[PDB]
Ligand binder design. Structure first.
Ligand SMILES: Nc1nc2c(ncn2[C@@H]2O[C@H](COP(=O)(O)OP(=O)(O)OP(=O)(O)O)[C@@H](O)[C@H]2O)c(=O)[nH]1
Ligand SMILES: Nc1nc2c(ncn2[C@@H]2O[C@H](COP(=O)(O)OP(=O)(O)OP(=O)(O)O)[C@@H](O)[C@H]2O)c(=O)[nH]1
Ligand SMILES: Nc1nc2c(ncn2[C@@H]2O[C@H](COP(=O)(O)OP(=O)(O)OP(=O)(O)O)[C@@H](O)[C@H]2O)c(=O)[nH]1
Ligand SMILES: Nc1nc2c(ncn2[C@@H]2O[C@H](COP(=O)(O)OP(=O)(O)OP(=O)(O)O)[C@@H](O)[C@H]2O)c(=O)[nH]1
Ligand SMILES: Nc1nc2c(ncn2[C@@H]2O[C@H](COP(=O)(O)OP(=O)(O)OP(=O)(O)O)[C@@H](O)[C@H]2O)c(=O)[nH]1
Ligand SMILES: Nc1nc2c(ncn2[C@@H]2O[C@H](COP(=O)(O)OP(=O)(O)OP(=O)(O)O)[C@@H](O)[C@H]2O)c(=O)[nH]1
Ligand SMILES: Nc1nc2c(ncn2[C@@H]2O[C@H](COP(=O)(O)OP(=O)(O)OP(=O)(O)O)[C@@H](O)[C@H]2O)c(=O)[nH]1
Ligand SMILES: Nc1nc2c(ncn2[C@@H]2O[C@H](COP(=O)(O)OP(=O)(O)OP(=O)(O)O)[C@@H](O)[C@H]2O)c(=O)[nH]1
Ligand SMILES: [Ca+2]
Ligand SMILES: [Ca+2]
Ligand SMILES: [Ca+2]
Ligand SMILES: [Ca+2]
Ligand SMILES: [Ca+2]
Lengths: 219, 216, 216, 219, 219, 216, 214, 214
């Protein structure tokens, strides 16, 4: 109810597709949820046998709680959705616009550790041309959630289709998963690329290959 | 019976294809096999005229035995098959997922020396999406065997098809073989690429080209 | 008593220096600590308003518990100290030995997020020469703790001095901190280098410069 | 007794320094030792449960035996020591000559797996200037042994000092150890550098730093 | 007659194709031809006004003779053909196997100076899979001749098609010719690429482009 | 006699130092010597079992003979020495002038096989500043002989000092020897660096390290 | 009448196509007169030609024009061509890349610095490699326009090789653009001329063009 | 008499040091006469000046000499200098690197292409950054010898900044060497002029020089 019309359009579009991140309605406010998380992380640290009396560690549970609710999972709250600016396509662009090497930082939902990546996004403007920076903001909004890279790519795609009023959008993400790099198999070199293509990017081999060939060069 | 359902499924698929690594059924436990290999490697080092009274060398046979059975050849034992986790394709991905630059280390079965490479794997999820690290674990499981790169590539492919429940998988491996680089011709610059393509990666030229172009 | 002689020697050296990681003595076994952490992480995820009925998410608390206790923080337990092997310096090396580009992954103790870096270690062997992989194992042991990079560097240094029986050791670490890159200021380009120098690496300007120049 | 005077000078110099690789006198000939090693590796392969009836594996024990005695450990036999060619230093070079990025392949003596590296060698000619290629040959000769990188560097240094008739030699080796990379800790990125410096390279800070600064750039 | 079956099969195929290096039958053993080449090269040095009494220069004619007959032109003698080892294609590979960046050193037949390059070879196994090192060996065999680059490429192709029992082979070479760089026009930058494509690699546009596109990352 | 004064100064200075390429006076003219060299190379090719009726090989003896006398060994004839222009150091430069990455192609005198290198030259002008291209020309002159790298470097050094009227000259050559790469050991990676330093470049440690650090 | 047979074939080819670069005195006299003119110019730039560094500049310039950088105007300077039979029956393109190319802006008389890439499919004959480099530099040593230079190299090779299957690409920095006027320090210009199969056959055309970029 | 105070200080400085580049007609007339001379040269190269591409080349050249590439001979073209007080009390070197530099060989009149690196330690004043680039290019737009050009930039900056603590390094490719004569396609030339502490103080000197290389 306190959401922008843009935020609301995108959330409902995600829900109707089955794509929304698995959520429940909060019944505690954010300040209280921060506090309760802090208490729980305090115990965790005790259960790791850490000495919380040390000046360096004493504030860690508070820092973590803050980080979870306000920082890295801020994209779970649609009040944080970016404000959307659109201008008319008076200049009548009908070739793709591409924003590449977008900084993306997320968190894998199976181990709660860092995902570090880059997104590349393109679209063919129909009636509206979006403010460039809103593209980076939308990618970062969906990334500030516990994620599976596959779902993250689909979410950013559907959101952009919805705001731009066109199906002709493509999203590609290339990322290092620290769940892979820093534990378990500990593969120091691998990276994962996922792609979600809509409209002509999916179905027009020249549009599709133009997009895909362009990604290949950087990651 | 002692193997996971996944591991037994992969092994039987490899066997029906003729792709399983040349194996005989085990008659001795892993620990006595280790003990005996240690015995044989002792004589080998004697026969090389090396002095085993050297502190540096004294334990090498035991180290080697331990390495063969427990590490570089641990993929000969399906009890070491990775645990497999799959989530539902509820997000409905229908474009390829590509894990590139997978660290791979193996052993050439003709000379028993190091193979050093990188794998790239892609699949189009059907009903399931695999945990990403499981792709790196599967590649390394098959790599921890005496191998011919051509067979290694096919085994990884078929194992992944079996577990993902789809033929839409592709595997590419690029590797330096030390049996080419460190002896014989001693080619210090060359490397070998092999590729195994399934379903659309083999037959669908847009999907096939998309994967092959990405590798390069 | 349950720890190796090496591990106990390192721990007591760290303790006498004031360098040990802030620890309390264990009152609960590792397995019940895991069980309990799993309980707390369940509530955390509830408090984030996440839906744990999702197949993808359902097991995350258990995965996290398991990760903290058994993997990324396993260096809090000296039973996991690496086995140490030393051979006699019979070859009489008296110039530095340098292992560079050691893979290092840690966790910042202020935000509990990933630290990703590379260590470079050098020493001048006195009576003993260490097995090379043991240098990478020691770096990673200390890294698998909640850490402040400045403390991590000093702990690696002192542990190596203790085991090598010489003060002539140097440690340098270069790392990206995700608590700087992935939240707060979100500096995507920066990195931090810390360096701890012992014996001649600190005081001898030719030895000191030789190491520092090599790092760059 | 069937050794060149060069080979004999170097072997005795190594022995008197305590640096020779740990060896015993053979009492079987090489052809017989190959055969006996083949028999033992055949058992090893059986103990790995491998099927030796397969065309690909049947010849592996023979290949391995051959590789050990004639290929990778050929440097254990001083009849394989390279022939040494020297010309007078009529041109009176008194500045270092440096051969860098010498291909080096060896085998670590603790696990019997590949070492892959590059050596850099320099010396200040006194009376004699060596044929360039003999430098690479000497490095490769000592490398074709089970090795510890520390001992390998010292061996190549003393050998060159002995043949060149001067102490002013330096050796640096930078190498990837597959005992580290492909088993155990499995560190995909690290590398080890060792240095052995004689004469002015050890003791003259300008000669020493000129050598060391020059290595730094490539590895 | 004294050749291996593989060497004879390949030599006859090249002769029936019209592709063999222009050879005559040797009336003199190799040792005698070295001795005579040494005599001729001794005279060439005299004719260059060089002082053969110089310690550095005295053995040069013998070194050159040994080099021509036993080293850089050893591929003129099919007794030096590689041993070929093949295993059954039981694993049923039916895609391209590619060995890239094979070290190749040869000699231009027009000026007898160094060619330095890299080969890339691919094949689709039919019934057999060749030992990888034999591909490098086969490339170097043909390279150890006075060559024209475009002939060298064709000969490697036919040799490989002959041993492997399939037309589906491709060879590509990229090389610097010192008869271009070190004399005449003295072009420091240029290089030459030649391509020989058989069976599917010539005829099947996807197979052909998969090969050619993969080479492009040669240089 | 038929030389430029410069050619004669350099030749004489190299003769006194003992640095000349081992030569003796010619009894035949260049044209006769080319004809005779073509006859010897004709026979060598015949003795290699090559078939001279082939159009592509037929002219090879004549090409080689031409290449030896007039091209790759043209630096043996001091009539081929570059013309030397100098302007006055009116600008009063007193810091090294460095020409780097000079193209150098030469022949190994032990095997008669290509050497491919780069030179770096620097000098501190005294009375004269040399035409920049003349430095490239001097390097290629001495390189168009059968050489050993150590001698070549000393020759270019003294030749420059004698023409510039100052000892303050430095020469560094970095080269790949095909006698190492294409035959014998066949090391595809290695390269050789030689340096010759005169005047301040040898003794003055700031001038010395300035030149050396710049070569890298 | 004093040219080689090849140099005549080429020159007639270019004339007939309309593709030649747009003779009373001998080479020696034209130098003396150029040198006289360049003297006045330096006077007109207020330079002091008594300076030792400067004194000999007019003759250097004259010599550079006639004998060096515009030596390609003289077909007596055309390279010698050697062909061998295509006995080896090569029927795939042969490509020489990164050919060193240096030339002059015909509009401002300023340095052009580039690289050429040339490919052909041998029909009956296989040209010596280094002659490809020589033909490129022959045409480059003229005042040029990059578009014309590329077309000239293409027709000449086609003529000498007895096949239309030849392709030429040149990538170059013009100091007319970098050192003067707009002073764009980063830009470069690519031109391509494609003949026979390189123009018409999409796989031959794409193989060439894909190769250039990579 | 028509120059700025700074341009006069610099010109006198260079004259007094012996470091100036070695005036009857106005700029407009010298162009017309240069243009007339370049016409005859093209005639003497046997070029057809009726060609549209070629027709206007003589005037382009004249204009390029007087107004563009040799515009540095005219101190009326000397850049404007703005200094601010060193209120911030910087006493460590300030370095501008990779300054775009384009010039001409005074010996063959051929393009020089380089980069300069300049450092100084501000004493009383801090120059606007872009004026450092402008001073470098002012001296470069003359027929030059690299060794002289570097010394000129150094004295000029010293004069304008009121400190001897200035250092100049230039790294450049001369087309006199690359496109002509020996045709060395890979070589480049570095020259350095060091003043005050940059010459005398080994740590200041090494800090500058170490910085250039890296
Ligand atoms: N489409 C397009 N957008 C541009 C271009 N240059 C800037 N923009 C965008 O124009 C938008 C500005 O509109 P507003 O939303 O009012 O800007 P803002 O309020 O400051 O919001 P933010 O930029 O996100 O911080 C930004 O989002 C820019 O990315 C451009 O060249 N093309
Ligand atoms: N499909 C997909 N999987 C991911 C993603 N991020 C992490 N994963 C994987 O999800 C899987 C988690 O399942 P589990 O098998 O229970 O994890 P684990 O038991 O600790 O096993 P390991 O990861 O091998 O150590 C791991 O394989 C992760 O690497 C992602 O973005 N997409
Ligand atoms: N010092 C020096 N040696 C060189 C140079 N160029 C070639 N050489 C060496 O000269 C030696 C030739 O002498 P020999 O031992 O008779 O040559 P070889 O018998 O063919 O032996 P190998 O070269 O090892 O195969 C080689 O080892 C070359 O490395 C050089 O420029 N300087
Ligand atoms: N000093 C030195 N050590 C080496 C060299 N090559 C290998 N090593 C090390 O020698 C050690 C062997 O001792 P062990 O501890 O018995 O080997 P391990 O028990 O299998 O232990 P890990 O190597 O950690 O798996 C290993 O650490 C090797 O990495 C070398 O060249 N020099
Ligand atoms: N097809 C294939 N061959 C391999 C692979 N790894 C190693 N090889 C080859 O297996 C062959 C070994 O068979 P043999 O010919 O009997 O070995 P060899 O006699 O020592 O021959 P060389 O290796 O050439 O010295 C070598 O040619 C290797 O290059 C692989 O992964 N696939
Ligand atoms: N087709 C082909 N030509 C080559 C090859 N290697 C060298 N060449 C060239 O073959 C030509 C030999 O013919 P000639 O005209 O007699 O050589 P040249 O007279 O010395 O002329 P220049 O090479 O221009 O100095 C030279 O241009 C070589 O560069 C090759 O592998 N294939
Ligand atoms: N198409 C083409 N143009 C070239 C070539 N070389 C130089 N030019 C251009 O020819 C043009 C000359 O036309 P003008 O209008 O007289 O040049 P200008 O009046 O000095 O003005 P600017 O060139 O913009 O500084 C310039 O734009 C040059 O860049 C070339 O090889 N091909
Ligand atoms: N020291 C110095 N020399 C330069 C500079 N620019 C050009 N030169 C050189 O000045 C010299 C001109 O002298 P000349 O002997 O008349 O030149 P040339 O007769 O045409 O002979 P080459 O230059 O060798 O082709 C050439 O060597 C140029 O390389 C410079 O900036 N500094
Ligand atoms: Ca995970
Ligand atoms: Ca093998
Ligand atoms: Ca923090
Ligand atoms: Ca080991
Ligand atoms: Ca040699």
């Amino acid at each position: 109810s306190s959401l922008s019309k843009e935020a609301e359009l995108v959330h409902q579009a995600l829900l109707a597709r089955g794509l929304e991140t698995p959520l429940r309605k909060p019944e505690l406010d954010a300040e209280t949820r921060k506090t309760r998380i802090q208490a729980h992380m305090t115990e965790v640290m005790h259960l790791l046998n850490l000495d919380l009396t040390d000046d360096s560690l004493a504030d860690t549970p508070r820092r973590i709680a803050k980080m979870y609710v306000d920082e890295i999972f801020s994209g779970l709250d649609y009040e944080n959705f970016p404000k959307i600016t659109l201008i008319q396509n008076k200049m009548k662009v009908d070739e793709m616009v591409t924003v590449r090497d977008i900084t993306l930082t997320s968190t894998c939902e199976h181990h709660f550790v860092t995902i570090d990546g880059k997104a590349t996004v393109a679209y063919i403007p129909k009636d509206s041309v979006i403010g460039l920076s809103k593209i980076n903001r939308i990618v970062q909004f969906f990334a500030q959630r516990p994620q599976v890279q596959e779902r993250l790519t689909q979410q950013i795609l559907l959101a952009l289709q919805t705001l731009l009023g066109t199906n002709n959008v493509a999203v590609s993400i290339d990322a290092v998963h620290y769940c892979v790099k820093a534990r378990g198999i500990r593969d120091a070199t691998s990276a994962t690329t996922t792609t979600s293509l809509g409209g002509l990017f999916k179905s027009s081999q020249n549009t599709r290959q133009e997009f895909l060939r362009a990604v290949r060069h950087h990651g």
